[PDB]
């Protein structure tokens with residue numbers, strides 16, 4: 001059972017602007033996603049200080065980067081606090097309405113796409129390199145859910161029947177045909193060392209066959 005939703009008009013406007021605008025510094029998507037994972041790990045660590053039982057779904061706090069050349073996917077896994085169904089559908093989009101408005105006024109004022117994180121909508125930088133994005137997430141107070149969007153004004157949400165995750169978020173980037181450079185180990189190492197060197201959680205870079 002798959003539910004289809006329409007993005008808010010401002011979010012769809014931001015996505016199409018990210019997909020259509022000519023901009024070569026595409027590597028900044030990895031900094032935003034890792035930064036998002038770092039915030040989710042911070043939130044579950046703080047909540048667990050006043051409630052140790054919130055770590056019963058997993059004690060490890062880490063981030064994993066997993067490239068797959070066969071499927072042409074780049075996956076960012078974190079064991080953070082995760083997102084509920086309400087987050088995926090209306091909560092995160094309501095917050096992002098003001099950040100999108102402010103971000104686009106700055107763009108016409110002289111700003112560039114690389115400061116998208118300062119407006120809280122850095123997740124959508126994934127569509128600099130992805131034709132489709134899948135998000136598997138599991139929050140302590142909800143079930144596991146699968147979010148997916150190929151832009152175009154709509155996204156879907158369903159109950160995930162895959163491998164149970166325990167707790168956290170998994171972002172699967174289905175890369176455009178000409179962006180396969182972000183599957184190479186030496187390229188991912190280079191971006192992480194340049195933009196995410198001081199993240200306070202272990203970042204493990206998987207390798208392939």
Ligand SMILES: Cc1c(CO)cnn1-c1ccc(F)cc1
Nearest residue numbers: 033036037039040043082123169
């Ligand atoms: C938005 C996002 C992603 C996707 O980049 C992964 N974890 N999170 C996240 C989830 C919950 C948070 F409180 C903060 C960040």
